[PDB]
Amino acid sequence: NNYALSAQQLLNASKIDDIDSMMGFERYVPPQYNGRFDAKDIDQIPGRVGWLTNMHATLVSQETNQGISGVDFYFLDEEGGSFKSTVVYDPYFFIACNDESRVNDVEELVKKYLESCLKSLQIIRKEDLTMDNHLLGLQKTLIKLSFVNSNQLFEARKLLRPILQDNARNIYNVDAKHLIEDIREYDVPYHVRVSIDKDIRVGKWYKVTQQGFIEDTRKIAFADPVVMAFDIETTKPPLKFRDSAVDQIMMISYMIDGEGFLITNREIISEDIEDFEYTPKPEYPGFFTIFNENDEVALLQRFFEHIRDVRPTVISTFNGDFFDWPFIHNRSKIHGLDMFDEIGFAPDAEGEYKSSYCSHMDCFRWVKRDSYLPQGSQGLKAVTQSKLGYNPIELDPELMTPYAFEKPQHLSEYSVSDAVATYYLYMKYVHPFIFSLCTIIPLNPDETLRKGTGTLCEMLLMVQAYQHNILLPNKHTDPIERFYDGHLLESETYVGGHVESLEAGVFRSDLKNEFKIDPSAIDELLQELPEALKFSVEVENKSSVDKVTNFEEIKNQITQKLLELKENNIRNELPLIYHVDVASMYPNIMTTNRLQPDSIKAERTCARKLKWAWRGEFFPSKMDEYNMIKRALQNETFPNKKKVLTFDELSYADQVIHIKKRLTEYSRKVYHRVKVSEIVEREAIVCQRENPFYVDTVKSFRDRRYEFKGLAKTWKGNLSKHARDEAKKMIVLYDSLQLAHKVILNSFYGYVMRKGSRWYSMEMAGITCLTGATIIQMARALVERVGRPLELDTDGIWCILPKSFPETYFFTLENGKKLYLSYPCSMLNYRVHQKFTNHQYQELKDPLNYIYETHSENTIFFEVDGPYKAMILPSSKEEGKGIKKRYAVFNEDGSLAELKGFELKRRGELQLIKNFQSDIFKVFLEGDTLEGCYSAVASVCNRWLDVLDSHGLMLEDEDLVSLICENRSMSKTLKEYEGQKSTSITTARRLGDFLGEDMVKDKGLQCKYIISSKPFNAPVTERAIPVAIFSADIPIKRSFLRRWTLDPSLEDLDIRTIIDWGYYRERLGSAIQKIITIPAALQGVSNPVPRVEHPDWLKRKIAT
DNA sequence: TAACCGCGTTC
DNA sequence: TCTTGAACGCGGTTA
Ligand SMILES: Nc1ncnc2c1ncn2[C@H]1C[C@H](O)[C@@H](COP(=O)(O)OP(=O)(O)OP(=O)(O)O)O1
Ligand SMILES: [Ca+2]
Ligand SMILES: [Ca+2]
Ligand SMILES: [Fe+3]
């Protein structure tokens, strides 16, 4: 019932109100005032001020029978206390009409059909970007159906779903039902709807008054919530995962606002623990006090009791939604405790643990979304070293439970290791970012942390659409089929970024390089030189040439250098290793071109036609064959007392899955292919006068990210003097903050392609990509002619320029100030603004009379990364091909500048290749000549080959397994890969066989394997031996080690007997080839490690 | 062979 | 239900 649901949500509400009272969040109703809610005199109006930390939807009773929708807001005050306060706002959505004439007619019919759920209805008007002449002022008439609570709203939709689907009777010559076109803004989440309409945001200060919340724009900083972070280490069966059903919590470490506490279960932890200290850097103090308890239930209850004592409004964990919280929850139930009644936490619809007064900050969600760290470096170990600057305590999870008996202090100091890292990781990186993000995104801390960047973008866009009175579009629904010249398509897409491998090998400042400069390109550069340094001064640095002392001097110094290189073109010199890269490329291409989904028109100036490249992946079959297989499927029966289902009876989508997978069979059996793919160049018109609310939202977020990037460089430019340890401290703060916004910023591009988007446009996303490829290839077309481009990717070109090429000069202003000039950079930027500027950008100057001014927009700019020391790019093993998206770059202080894509960086490759790649790359700095350098690298390669050919003799059996184990992660559970083979798959099966099916039950299983030599002549996937078998009982070992070798006579069990050493040697050989010997070949040096042979295509090209 | 896939990168 | 995109390397599969 609708009155039953409201009754259920009402006692949830009274429970929450009691938990909030317990934790200090009593509902405050402000003193009554009947005056002007004048905002300047804020300190006269009676009420209570507070920093807003949370907001949850609610249902509120009479203070009729059903409740009223509202939102509880959770504040911290100025007096060290807390309070909570409720706002009510009627849920609402809109009905649109085919004909504006009879709008009241459909308004009386809706008053009839929704009589038992509607509360009120208005006639309002919003701007529809779909509508004709909306730019001249026209608006859309809509009925605003208002409701008492969120249940009546969904109830009205359930009644209107008939009427809408119904319109999809004397035939010899309209009713009110058939004028309901669609319904709008029914989707909007309620607390989002309140936070938007009432302009309330978590993280701002408000004075709560009877007239509403008053933003107090005076307070400088946030308040200071009491923050608590906790980790739990529990018992574990050997070589098995931790199971809440069987195991029990050994200890719970935690920190509350800099003070640490460890609670221990003295029924598994042998002795008792003294209050010790763990501070791995001076800035991260950690004095812990231990609460030694007896049983678990005593441990679980010093925990629950300590939470109520401190009443924290933030609790942080690391992966606490998947492991820590559900473990504590289930072990309290077995001990007869309701965690909700004790703490207020309970799982939500996604199984994540949330409370009302207290945000649950799982940092694992931050590192995964916003850290800009590779997944290989997203464990808490790596996250501490990267972003906190020390090496935390580390302990083998197999030694964990026995060290509880044998060495309790060590396990105690690994437990507080994880807690100190978690608390300070939250306070330095997660807390400032999320709560600042909350001041602009209409969500509370829990959802700001966990929602996807696409969805964060939708929020920001929905505030904008609303505040400019723009009617929200409904969410996009995927076309269930599309057809291309009769062929059913699998994927409709566009050509994305351009990326080129051009040269491989070692390039280095100390070693000369041959260049062949195009004289005709120089001629161009000096022709455009005069206007290009005017550009560097006025548009790059935002000044005037009229104020610069030495414009002609710099203009002459470049001229002779360019002229010298024009006559003496074929030159052999040291190179300048540089990187050019467009700053926020795709956003700036959108803002420069006024690119937004509502701007894309279809034949119906103000018109900037731009091209994109459409790619379809259709089946080779004809359409006669498509209906043939559909008829085949219709005659056959499908499963679900009704487990018998017509083909027609199933949803149009699921049908497609069956048609598509049957069509892959017929195509893979009549046409020898599953997909034919085709590029089609298409053009679209982009209206330059359309409401730029989307473009302006991306412009505003771009500007927000740019400021953090500029502050980062400002401290980098201030790095000359603990100055070298405090200036470099923030380089990371600000870079993190700029990198955190990078993914959200670029999601404004991806958003227009996302499922369920409200502003879907493939045309828009394709136009951005094609423009970006045209720009990057224009830049390479010129760098070819004056240097050697090494590697190019979307918006970036690595290159060597002749040492003779003009680089850096400083303009001087009458002020005495200097302006930075990189002629390699400004020579491209000037070309970009010549060739890619939008001279059709129209913007309303006077809205009151609809008068637009037209002007020229170009925010596209390259940026120069740096004069570098060395760069090592690998080469493919196949002829002619290169390897894209991998390389290493070094700074002139020897330090590593960039490492991209190599197995060293990726999550769980074969460790041997990871340690090899960690070793050689720095060795590429040694030697005095190109060949002397390759000889230094070779010496490292032979040392590794020595390890492999010696069958790791001189290597301990503990490191030998660490070095030869590959670690692949199963994105699902083993059941879902049915009909697939992989080393990750079979090693997971063989592990379920060995240790039980209970370790095959959770997704994301880490599969650590060895490839065995036996069974010989078998595919590599059938020889993947899980690594824990060698840690097992000698009986259990020798059983499975032969069931997997298919050698029942097997007796020797030393790892060196089982391992297919020829297999790992071929892998090491491949890494030696691609990084070293084959690029060596391409730079004219004979193979530097003869023990790894060149391929026969390279052997043929030594004699030819 | 040529085609395609899963994972985790670089954009 | 909630859900940013495409390009690419590598080691495995398949017919
Ligand atoms: N996560 C991503 N999601 C969507 N598009 C991306 C993403 N990363 C990169 N791109 C797209 C849009 C980028 O503008 C473009 C080039 O990427 P990239 O050079 O790494 O960053 P950027 O140019 O956007 O900012 P910046 O160079 O200032 O750090 O490719
Ligand atoms: Ca842990
Ligand atoms: Ca860029
Ligand atoms: Fe137009």
Author numbering: 28 to 90, 110 to 214, 220 to 224, 233 to 663, 676 to 711, 717 to 797, 804 to 1186
Give the authors' words.
At the eukaryotic replication fork, the family B replicative DNA polymerases epsilon (Pol ε) and delta (Pol δ) synthesize the leading and lagging strand, respectively. The exonuclease domains of family B polymerases have several highly-conserved motifs (named Exo-motifs), which include the catalytic residues (D290, E292, D383 and D477 in yeast Pol ε). The catalytic residues serve as ligands for two metal ions, and substituting both D290 and E292 with alanine abolishes the proofreading function of the polymerase, which in turn increases the in vitro mutation rate by ~100-fold. At present, many structures of family B DNA polymerases with proofreading capacity have been determined, and their overall structures are well conserved, consisting of a thumb, palm, fingers and the exonuclease domain.
Here we report the crystal structure of the catalytic core of S. cerevisiae Pol ε with a P301R substitution, orthologous to P286R in human Pol ε. There were no rearrangements of the N-terminal, exonuclease, finger, palm, thumb or P-domains, nor were there any alterations in the interactions with DNA and the incoming nucleotide in the ternary complex of Pol2CORE-P301R. The P301R substitution is located in a loop, called the Exo-loop, but does not affect the overall conformation of the Exo-loop. In the Pol2CORE-P301R structure, the R301 points toward the catalytic site, forming an ion pair with E292. In contrast to the wild-type, the P301R structure harbors only a Ca2+ ion in the A-site, coordinated by water molecules and three catalytic residues D290, E292 and D477. Interestingly, we observe a steric clash between the terminal residue of the ssDNA and R301, suggesting that R301 will interfere with the binding of ssDNA to the exonuclease site. Taken together, the structural and molecular dynamic simulation data show that the mechanism of exonuclease inactivation in Pol2CORE-P301R involves a steric obstruction of ssDNA binding in the exonuclease site, in addition to the loss of catalytic activity. To summarize, our structural and molecular dynamics simulation studies revealed that the cancer-associated P301R substitution prevents proper positioning of ssDNA in the exonuclease active site of Pol ε.
